[PDB]
Amino acid sequence: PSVPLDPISVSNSSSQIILKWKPPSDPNGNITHYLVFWERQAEDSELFELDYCHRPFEKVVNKESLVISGLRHFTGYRIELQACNQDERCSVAAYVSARTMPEAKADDIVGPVTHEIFENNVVHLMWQEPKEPNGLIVLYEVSYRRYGDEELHLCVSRKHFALERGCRLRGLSPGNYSVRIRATSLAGNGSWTEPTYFYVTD
Amino acid sequence: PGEVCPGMDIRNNLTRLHELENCSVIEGHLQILLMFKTRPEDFRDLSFPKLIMITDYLLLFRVYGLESLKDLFPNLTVIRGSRLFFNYALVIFEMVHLKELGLYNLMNITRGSVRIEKNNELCYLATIDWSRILDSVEDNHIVLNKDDNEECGDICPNCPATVINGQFVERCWTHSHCQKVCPTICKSHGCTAEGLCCHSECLGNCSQPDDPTKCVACRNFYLDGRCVETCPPPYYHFQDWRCVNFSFCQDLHHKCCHQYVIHNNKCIPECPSGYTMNSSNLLCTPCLGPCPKPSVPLDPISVSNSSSQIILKWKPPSDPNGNITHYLVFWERQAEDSELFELDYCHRPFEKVVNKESLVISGLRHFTGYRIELQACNQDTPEERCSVAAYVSARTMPEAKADDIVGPVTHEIFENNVVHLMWQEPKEPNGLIVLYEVSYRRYGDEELHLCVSRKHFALERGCRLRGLSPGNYSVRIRATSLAGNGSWTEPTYFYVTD
Numbered sequence: 100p101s102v103p104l105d106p107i108s109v110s111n112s113s114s115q116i117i118l119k120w121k122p123p124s125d126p127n128g129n130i131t132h133y134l135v136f137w138e139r140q141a142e143d144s145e146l147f148e149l150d151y152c153h154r155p156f157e158k159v160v161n162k163e164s165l166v167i168s169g170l171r172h173f174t175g176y177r178i179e180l181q182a183c184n185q186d187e188r189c190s191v192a193a194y195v196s197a198r199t200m201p202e203a204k205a206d207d208i209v210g211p212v213t214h215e216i217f218e219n220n221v222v223h224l225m226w227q228e229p230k231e232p233n234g235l236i237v238l239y240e241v242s243y244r245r246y247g248d249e250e251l252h253l254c255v256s257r258k259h260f261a262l263e264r265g266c267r268l269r270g271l272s273p274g275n276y277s278v279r280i281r282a283t284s285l286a287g288n289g290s291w292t293e294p295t296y297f298y299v300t301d
Numbered sequence: 302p303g304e305v306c307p308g309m310d311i312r313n314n315l316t317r318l319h320e321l322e323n324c325s326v327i328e329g330h331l332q333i334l335l336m337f338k339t340r341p342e343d344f345r346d347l348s349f350p351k352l353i354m355i356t357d358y359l360l361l362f363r364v365y366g367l368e369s370l371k372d373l374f375p376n377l378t379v380i381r382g383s384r385l386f387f388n389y390a391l392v393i394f395e396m397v398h399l400k401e402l403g404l405y406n407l408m409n410i411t412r413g414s415v416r417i418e419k420n421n422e423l424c425y426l427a428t429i430d431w432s433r434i435l436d437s438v439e440d441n442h443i444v445l446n447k448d449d450n451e452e453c454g455d456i457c458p459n460c461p462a463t464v465i466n467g468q469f470v471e472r473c474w475t476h477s478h479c480q481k482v483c484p485t486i487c488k489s490h491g492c493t494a495e496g497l498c499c500h501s502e503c504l505g506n507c508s509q510p511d512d513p514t515k516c517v518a519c520r521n522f523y524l525d526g527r528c529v530e531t532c533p534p535p536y537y538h539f540q541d542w543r544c545v546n547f548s549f550c551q552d553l554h555h556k557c558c559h560q561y562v563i564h565n566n567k568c569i570p571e572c573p574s575g576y577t578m579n580s581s582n583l584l585c586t587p588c589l590g591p592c593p594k595p596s597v598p599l600d601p602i603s604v605s606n607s608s609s610q611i612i613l614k615w616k617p618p619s620d621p622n623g624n625i626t627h628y629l630v631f632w633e634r635q636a637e638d639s640e641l642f643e644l645d646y647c648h649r650p651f652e653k654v655v656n657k658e659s660l661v662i663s664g665l666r667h668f669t670g671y672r673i674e675l676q677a678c679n680q681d682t683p684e685e686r687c688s689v690a691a692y693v694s695a696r697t698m699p700e701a702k703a704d705d706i707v708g709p710v711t712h713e714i715f716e717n718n719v720v721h722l723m724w725q726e727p728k729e730p731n732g733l734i735v736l737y738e739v740s741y742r743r744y745g746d747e748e749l750h751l752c753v754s755r756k757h758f759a760l761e762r763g764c765r766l767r768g769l770s771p772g773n774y775s776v777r778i779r780a781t782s783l784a785g786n787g788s789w790t791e792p793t794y795f796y797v798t799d
């Protein structure tokens with residue numbers, strides 16, 4: 100049979116993929132079913148090392164759309180669609196690629212924001228990284244703030260964060276400082292952590 | 302050095318691919334397609350390092366398991382494009398699993414363009430500067446690849462770096478192979494590792510400089526281990542790349558398919574129109590008599606290659622209903638997006654184009670949008686009747702140093718040890734400056750930042766750093782405009798008393 104026509108890969112949900120297509124221009128026989136193959140593409144090795152500072156299938160009978168469920172959030176997938184008119188002699192494949200949606204709170208940081216202060220008044224911050232994120236987390240932003248002043252920032256990269264095990268603020272003048280934290284992943288910006296306060300003794 | 306083999310169309314399995322074992326030149330095309338049962342293992346120990354040049358085109362279509370060409374064709378240097386695939390000499394299409402090209406010896410594509418489409422894993426594309434490899438990149442078609450939806454961390458090994466259109470980026474083919482860049486005088490001849498130009502008859506690479514017997518490939522024609530400008534008598538040009546004698550063309554003729562003939566010192570498949578095969582000497586000779594046997598202008602495209610030049614192109618109206626006399630180009634400056642000043646991010650000059658279907662508009666403001674109205678006229682003299690307008694919009698390029706901050710970085714210190722910084726804003730920038738970044742730094746520590754918005758900067762008249770611990774601090778400043786990042790100011794130092 101002819102090639103399946105007009106495939107469109109759309110993702111309306113974080114787990115659902117809705118593949119749509121028109122039937123082959125030349126079925127040359129009574130079409131029995133379609134044959135959808137999907138395949139996870141592995142994540143890019145190099146993304147973990149940069150400083151920014153048979154497969155499950157389905158035979159679709161009498162239908163021209165499919166909703167693929169139970170799929171990993173914000174991940175690219177190779178979809179191979181074929182048509183069969185006897186159950187094998189099937190049409191040449193129709194390739195299409197689709198990237199799933201991210202999750203809502205995958206990048207949001209939970210649990211207590213902890214700190215330590217050393218004999219030299221350095222503040223070693225520690226917070227638990229969001230265990231299961233959208234793809235991976237490419238960096239973090241440390242936003243400390245002294246009441247009344249303007250906002251300050253700091254990009255903490257993967258290698259830095261994973262090495263120190265959180266952050267380390269060296270030599271700040273005394274006072275009560277306000278902190279907000281915002282995880283930056285491949286997908287976007289995980290919601291700002293509620294303001295914490297810490298007072299470095301005078 | 303190796304043999305010259307004819308073109309191949311290799312399908313289903315890799316078996317027939319081993320017929321290429323000793324080929325150094327493919328006299329024809331190479332098509333590789335429809336291999337659904339091939340696996341990575343099949344290519345891991347599969348290599349053709351002898352292959353240097355292909356005279357027609359290279360096409361790769363639906364080849365499963367192949368992740369790179371760096372091991373298949375490590376020395377492929379030139380694609381001549383004698384025959385093309387829809388005007389393309391290189392086609393890499395729907396190569397699912399291919400992660401990189403790795404054609405680290407490919408220096409020149411003499412004719413035709415590159416079409417790389419629908420390769421969902423293909424990276425190491427942005428690091429290749431195709432303008433160094435092809436004379437015209439305008440007809441390239443590089444779309445729907447992984448490279449587009451920027452997930453490629455194309456990290457080069459030391460490699461040379463060149464500018465794209467503002468962005469200075471390092472150039473490489475793979476994680477382990479840099480892209481070779483020769484001195485500008487050397488361009489098509491190629492060069493050695495030390496940078497000495499190859500001989501003028503070489504193409505792409507040579508083993509020793511200024512020696513026409515040590516070329517990797519020839520610029521014009523190849524004959525008897527030497528690159529020659531033309532085939533001298535009594536030899537004939539064959540397939541626009543090699544010199545052959547009369548006897549060879551004659552043997553081909555008698556084996557035939559196409560029964561080869563000689564014309565204009567070339568051995569060609571058939572006589573051109575109006576000429577006929579003089580049997581004896583195989584020479585095409587001419588036959589006496591027969592041989593015995595208004596609407597809208599279409600598709601406007603606005604392009605800007607310069608900070609001041611705009612190159613507008615268009616097709617004529619589908620129904621001219623008369624002889625078109627001229628075109629009428631109008632341009633008009635759009636001022637600037639009102640909200641940009643109130644958000645915190647922390648007759649017109651014209652031209653009558655006669656006998657031409659393109660215009661280059663000069664003396665235009667940098668990084669500015671423009672409304673261009675194009676019309677067509679097919680009479681001008683008594684009372685003009687012209688076409689309905691063709692609307693098109695284009696944004697000019699930014700300037701190089703428009704956003705760079707000049708003049709002394711000045712400071713003051715108050716009784717409460719607050720440091721009021723003051724520096725002159727870049728008077729004429731690319732559009733406008735949307736914010737600034739203040740980067741103070743204590744020697745040894747990590748970088749610190751501060752986003753200073755427009756209203757803030759304009760109010761305070763520079764910056765104001767409140768309550769810093771004593772010491773000598775280093776400062777860098779970076780203006781951020783609508784266009785990009787005005788170069789970091791050289792490190793200044795200031796010492797706050799203890």
Ligand SMILES: *[C@@H]1O[C@H](CO)[C@@H](O)[C@H](O)[C@H]1NC(C)=O
Binds near residue numbers: 314316
């Ligand atoms: C390669 O393909 C041909 C074409 O049908 C087939 O006859 C041959 O058996 C195949 N060889 C292998 C090793 O798959």
Ligand SMILES: *[C@@H]1O[C@H](CO)[C@@H](O)[C@H](O)[C@H]1NC(C)=O
Binds near residue numbers: 319323
């Ligand atoms: C390549 O050359 C070697 C040299 O002896 C020969 O054994 C081999 O058969 C050749 N390969 C082909 C495909 O002709």
Ligand SMILES: *[C@@H]1O[C@H](CO)[C@@H](O)[C@H](O)[C@H]1NC(C)=O
Binds near residue numbers: 432433434435488520
């Ligand atoms: C490739 O070589 C030809 C032969 O002289 C030359 O005309 C062309 O400009 C070269 N292409 C480049 C340098 O991109």
Ligand SMILES: *[C@@H]1O[C@H](CO)[C@@H](O)[C@H](O)[C@H]1NC(C)=O
Binds near residue numbers: 406481493505506517
């Ligand atoms: C030219 O070919 C030689 C052959 O080994 C190779 O070592 C060299 O790197 C090549 N030079 C360029 C610029 O490709």
Ligand SMILES: *[C@@H]1O[C@H](CO)[C@@H](O)[C@H](O)[C@H]1NC(C)=O
Binds near residue numbers: 606610612
């Ligand atoms: C832009 O193209 C025009 C048309 O050929 C040319 O005259 C001009 O020099 C080009 N400018 C740049 C910067 O390439």
Ligand SMILES: *[C@@H]1O[C@H](CO)[C@@H](O)[C@H](O)[C@H]1NC(C)=O
Binds near residue numbers: 469785787788
């Ligand atoms: C400005 O940003 C571009 C983005 O790629 C970068 O290449 C360039 O080096 C930056 N300039 C400075 C002075 O940091």
